[PDB]
RNA sequence: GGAAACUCAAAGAGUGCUAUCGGAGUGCGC
C-alpha cells in the first residue's frame, strides 16, 4: 500500500530557502498584471526597483488563458503580458484555474517566487512554507518573506 | 568479334564474387585474424571455387559447338 | 561434447554436422547460430585443449553407461531375487545405504519401506505430524505403476 | 555489519524484479541473471532451492548506482518491470546496467548505449556474459545511426552528462520510445549548470520535458546517497496530453 | 619554431644596479631593466631541449611503430632548465649551467639591451648547481677562474631525468686575457 | 591516435599545475598513482592529472577506465618532473588528484580549470 | 508540429499584406524544394522578399532572411503574387506591378488617383486580377492588355475580395455592409448571390479549394461558413478568447480553416465540425 | 506526397508503398496519433511491397556500418533501383520517406529522380512500422528480429571499439579454475582406484604411493599371475622384486574378474586424465606467457593465473588499486615489507600487460631485478 | 457450512481478426 508523503525539498532549510539565488524567477499572474496597470507601475523595472536584482518573469499557459478569457477590458494587460522580455511556461493539467495551477507549480519546485495579488492565493502561498510572494502596493511592489529584501 | 568473351567475363566476375561471398559466408561477424586459419580458409574457398569451375567445364563440354 | 568434437570452431559449422546428434530440427538452429554468433574466436591452442576436454567428458559419459550396465549385471549376480523384484538402481541404493547385505537383511519390513526419507520421518515423529510412507522405494518400478494412495499400499 | 556468512531473508518488494534482503540491517537486492560472477565487485546472496539447485542474488550499492538511490528513497512506480524493454542512455559500465538487466529478466532486453571507448570495451566484455543486453558504442546525441539495430523500446532511462539532456532524451524517445511509455531521467545539477542552483535547474529541465511532450509525474531528489541529482519519471503521452 | 610558456623563474644575478638577469625554468633567460615590468631581452631555450625517452622504454609494447607513435612526436619534448646563472659583477659576460653539460657564457652588448652567445664550455657533465668566478692579474690582463659545482641531483629535489655520466665534482676553467 | 590523447598544451599546463601547487599548500591533493585511484574509486576527486612520459605509460593509463566511468575529468601533462616540482615533493610524482572540498579557497580556480579541460576534451 | 520556422522583425509600422511565391529568377535555378519564399509589404513604403530555410525535404547538405527589398514612392496597402512567371502586384496610392528582377515598378495601373485597399490574383486564367479601393469600388485588371478593364461602385467599401479556384470567373467580395456579395465577372450588373448573415463588417472571405464553401470572418467576434448554393449561414464558430477576426483562410486540405484574431492568436478550426481526421474503416465510412 | 517509404531492419531492407495519406495538418491530434499505435488502421495506411534480406552476416554488418555513417551500399541501391519508378519529368519526381537527413543527400546524389523526405510525418510513419514490426511483413522471412539484432549489435559494437580479441584472460581464468579442480578429481578417482584394487592386491598402496604410476602399473598387471617379468617393472614404475614376491606372499585376495576388468578401464582412463592435466598446465604456462608476460615473469605462471582468478578478470585486476592486491597464500617486518613490495610491483606489471595492446617481457624482467635487489637488501 | 462447472441462463472486464465489351489494330498521348 503506497503512501506518499513528499519530502521537504532538500534545497530548503527550516524556512530559509537558500535555493533563491538573486537572479530570480517570478510567477506573474492575472490580477497582479491588472493591478500593476491600474497602479501604473512598470513590470521589469518595477520588480528591479523592489528587489534590487535581475528578475526573469514567467507566465504560464493557464494564466495566459485567463488573461485572454477576461475579455476586451484588459487588452492593455494582454498586450503588456505578451512581452518578449518575459518567458513562458507550458502547463499540462485539466482546468485553466490560475490559483491551483500556481500553487501546485510552486509547491513542487520551491524555487519560484509568486507575484500575486488576490486574497485566497496569498493565503495558500503564505500557508505553505518558504516561498516568497510579492504584490502591488501604493506605487511600488512589496515582498512578504524574502530573507534578503535589501 | 562475337566470341565467348561475354561468358568469359561473367565467368571471371563469377569467380571473384563467389570467392569473396563464400569468405563472407564464413567468418560471420569478425574477420578472423590468425595466419594459418586465414590461409586454410583461403585453401577451402579455392577448393569450393574450383569445384564450381569444374562444373562450368562439365556443362560447357556438354554445350561446346564453338571455340 | 560431441558437437564441440565435431565442429571445433564455429566457422566450420556451415559445411558439416552429424545427424547422429541433434536430430533434424536443431541442426539448422545451431548452424544459423554459428553464423550470427556473438562470441569471439579462439585459436588452435585452446581449441585442441578444449577438444581434449571434450574427449575426457565424452569418455566419462560412455564409462558411466558401461559402469551402470556393470552395476546391473553385478547386482543380478549377487542378489538376483531383490533385483528381480524391485529393480537394480533401487536395490543398489538400499544396500549401499544400509551398509552390509547382512545388516540390511537384519531389518524389518517397516524400515525397509521407509529407509530413504528418514529425516522427514524423524522430524515428523518429534513434532506432531504423520510419518511418510515411500522413502527410497518410491523410485521402484511398481509404486510408480500404482495410482493414488494405492502407491502407499 | 552485513559480513560474509550471515543469513538474510529475501522478501519481495513493490517493484517486481527487485527484492529486499532483510537481515539485522537491510539491503536492496536483485536476482542475478548469470550466476557465479560479480561484475563490479558487489556482494552476492546465494540461496539454495530444491536435484539440488543454487541461485544467487546481487546487492545494489546505491552510492555507486543511480536509480538504486531512487528505489530506496521510494518512487511510486518505475517502468522497469520484469518483462519490458529498457533503453539506457549513458550506460557507463556494467555497474548499473547489470542491475537493470537482471531486474528486466531473461525475456526483456536492455539496449545500453555509450559514447566513450574504454567504458565501451568494458561494457562489451561484460555484455558477453549475460545475453539480454545489447551494447551500443554510439553517441546518444545521434539516434539515427543506431536506428538500424534497436526497435520500439518500452522505457528509457538517462544518465548522460551533457547540458543538452532534454534534447538527447527527446530525440531518443521520439525515435524509439513507444506511446504511453516511461522515461526515467537522472539530472545532475552541478553537471548541467554550475551558475544557478539545484531547484532552478531542475524546474528548467522538467519544463523542457513538458515542452517536448513527456508529461512528468515524479520528481525525487535522492539526497542521502548522492548530492543534488534528481530522478524525474515521466510518461510519453503524444495523444491527450491534458 | 617550437616554444612554450614559462614554468618558473629560478636563478638570478645583478649585472649592475640597474639591470639584472633571470634564468627561468623553461629555458628562457631574461635581461631586465629597472624601468620596465616587461623584460628587455628574453632569449629562448637556453641549452637546447632534452633528448626524448627512447622507443624501447616508453610503452612496454613490442612493435617499433607503436612504441614510436607513443612518443606523440615532439609534443612532449622538455627544455633544459637553467640550473644556475651568475654574472661577473659590473661586467658584460654571464655564465649559465644545466645538466646539458655545457656552461654557455653569453656576452651583453654595449647598448645594454641585448646579448649573444660568446662561448660554450663542454667540460662539466652533470647538473651545475652554482657558478662562481674568481680572477687574478693586473689592471690590464685578467686571468679568470670559472668554478662551478657539479652534481648528479638538483640542489632542491632529486628529480634526476636522463643523467648520464655525471660525477660529484668541481669544474674549473682558467679563461684568460 | 596515441594512447595519451588529451595532452594539454603549454598555457593550460601552467595553469593546471599552479592550481596543483596551491592545492598542495592547501592540503587538498593526493600524490601518486595508487592513492589517485584509491581516491578515485572512493569518489572524492575534482579532477585527475597524469604524466605522459613515464617509462611504462600503462601504469597510469589504468586511470582513464576509472575516471571517465565515474565521470570526472582527466588530463595528461608532458612532464613528470615538472609535475613533481608542481606538487612540491622530491621524487617525480606521475599521477596527481585534487580532492573535492567546499571548504577550500581555490574553488574558483579549480572550477575554471575543470571547465577549461572539459572543453578541451 | 504547430510551431514556427523563423521570425522576422520585418518592418517598423503596421505590416499590411504578405504572400508566398516560388520566385523564378533568371540568373538562378529555382531551389524551391529546399527553401521557401515569402514577401510582405507594409505601410512604411517597403516590400521585402525573404527566403525561409525549411526542412520539408532532406535533399541538401545559409541565406536565411531578407533576399531583397523593393522600395516604393508612396506607402503600400496590400500585395498578391501572380502565381506564374514570378510577377507580383501591390496596392497603395495606386496599384503597381513588379517582378523580382527589378527594384523599380514595371507598371502602374490605376483608374484615377485613388488608393486601393486590397488585391487578389486568380487561381486560373492567371493574367487577370481584381482589387478594391476606398472609393467603395471594385476594379478588375488584365495584365494581358496591361490595363484596368471594368469598375463597379457598391454602397460601402469592399474589404477583401477572393476568386474562386474552380469557376475562374466568379469571386466573393467582403465589404462593410454585413453581407458578402458573390459576383460573376463577365456580367457585373448583378451580384448573383448575397450571403447575408452577420451583424458587423465582413472583414475577410475565402473559397475553399473544393470550390463550393465560403469561410468568412467578421469584425464582430465570429466566423461563419457558408455554402455557395444557399445564401445563408451553414454554421458559425466563435470563442470567448478571440476578438475581431481579421483574416480567415481555408487550407489546401479543404477541411481546416485558419482564422486569425486581433488578440494575437492564429487559431484553427475544422470546417465540418464533426468529421474527424483519422482514416476510417470502410463500414464506418459507409 | 510521401508515396514510398524505406525501412531498414536487422534482417533486411524493406520498401513500403504508401497506399493513402496521413492527415498532415492535424498530425498532433489524439485521434490521429493513436492510429499509429493500433494495428487495424496502420495496414490501411502502409502495405509491404518489397523486402530483400541481406543474408550474409558480414554483409549485414557492412550495411549497418554504411547506414550508421550515412552512406549508400550495394543492397540498398539495388532495391531502390528495382522498386523506385522512373517518374518522368512531365509528371513529377518520386518521393521517398527515409529516416534521416544524414542519409538524404547520399541517395539524392545517386538517384536524381528520387526525392528523400524526413519531416515528422516520415518520422512517425517509420515509428509506426517499427512498432508493429513483424506483423507487417506477413511471412516474407525466415527468422525473428531480436536475436538477429542482438548479434548485429554485438558485432557493430566490437567493430566500433576495434576490440582486440587476442587479449583473452577468460581462457586463463577457466584454465586455472579447471586445473585445480581437475587435480582434486584425479586425486579422488585415484583413491578410488587404490580402494578398488586393494581387494585384489592390498600390498600395492604401501609400495607404489604415486597415483599416476600406480594407475599405470594397475593397467599393467591385471591379475596376480605375473611372477616372472622383472624387466618391465622399472619401466612401468629394486622395488620390482618387492612387488613380484609380494604378488605371491601376500594373498589378501579376492579372485574376482569382471570388476578387475572395470578397474582396468577406470585406471587407464584416470591415466588419460593425468596426461590431460600434464598438458593443460603447460598450455596455460605458455598462454600466461602470451597474454600476461610481465606479471608472468614477475610472479610466476600459475601464481599469476591464481591471482587473475582471484581478481576476476585482468581488466578488473588492473583497475584495482595497488594496495588491494592483498591475496592470501600467494606472494609468499622483514617478512612483510618484501610482500608489500611484491604486491604493488605485481599491480604495476598487471597495469602494463593489460593496458598494452600486446605486451613485452622487458619490463617484467627489470621489475624482477628491482624486487630482487630489494630482497638482497636483506 | 466446502463446492465438482461437466445442467444451463442473464450479464461485466481483458485478450486476439479483415478491405474497396477480350487481345491487338486504327485517329490517337511523351
Ligand atoms: Zn496551467
Write out key terms for the chains shown:
part of a larger assembly; 8 chains; A: 6-stranded mixed beta sheet; 6 helices; 16% strand; F: 121 residues; alpha+beta; globular; binds zinc ion; RNA-binding; U3 small nucleolar RNA-associated protein 6 (chain B); Nucleolar protein 58 (chain C)
Task: Describe this protein's structure.
This is part of a larger assembly, with eight protein chains of eight kinds. Chain C is mainly α. Chain C has eight helices and no strands. In chain C, helix 3 packs across helix 5. Chain E contains one helix and eleven strands, in the order ββββαβββββββ. Chain E is globular. In chain H, the strands form two sheets. A three-stranded antiparallel sheet of chain H has the order 1-2-3, sandwiched between helices. Chain H has a two-stranded parallel ribbon with strand order 4-5. Chain H is 55% helix and 6% strand. Chain H has 378 residues and is mostly helical. The radius of gyration of chain H is 36 Å and the shape is elongated. The structure holds one RNA strand of 30 nucleotides.
List the helices and strands and how they pair.
The structure is cut from a larger assembly and holds eight protein chains of eight kinds.
Chain A (H helix, E strand, L loop, with lengths): L23 E5 L1 H8 L6 H8 L3 E5 L1 H9 L5 H7 L5 E2 L9 H10 L5 E3 L3 H9 L5 E5 L2 E4 L7
Parallel strand pairs in A: 1-2, 1-4, 2-3, 4-5
Antiparallel strand pairs in A: 5-6
Chain B lengths: L4 H21 L9 H27 L6
Chain F lengths: L9 H16 L3 E3 L1 H10 L4 E5 L6 H4 L1 H5 L6 E4 L2 H8 L7 E4 L8 H14 L1
Parallel strand pairs in F: 2-3
Antiparallel strand pairs in F: 1-4, 2-4
Chain H binds one RNA strand of 30 nucleotides through loops.
PDB class: ribosome
Keywords: ribosome assembly, 90S to pre-40S transition, cryo-EM, Dhr1, Utp24, ribosome
Entry title: Cryo-EM structure of 90S small ribosomal precursors complex with the DEAH-box RNA helicase Dhr1 (State F)
Give the DSSP E fraction of chain G (strand runs of 2 or more residues). 35-45%
User: Which percent bin holds the helix content of chain H?
Assistant: 55-70%
What share of the residues of chain H does DSSP label as strand, in percent? Answer: 5-15%
Largest interface: D-H, 37 and 41 residues
Largest sheet of chain G: 4 strands, antiparallel
Largest sheet of chain H: 3 strands, antiparallel
Q: Name the assembly state.
A: part of a larger assembly
Per DSSP E runs of 2 or more residues, the count of β-strands of chain G stands at 23
Sequence of strands across the biggest β-sheet of chain H:
1-2-3
Number of helices of chain G: 1
What is the structural class of chain H? mainly alpha
PDB class: ribosome
Keywords: ribosome assembly, 90S to pre-40S transition, cryo-EM, Dhr1, Utp24, ribosome
Entry title: Cryo-EM structure of 90S small ribosomal precursors complex with the DEAH-box RNA helicase Dhr1 (State F)
Chain A: rRNA-processing protein FCF1
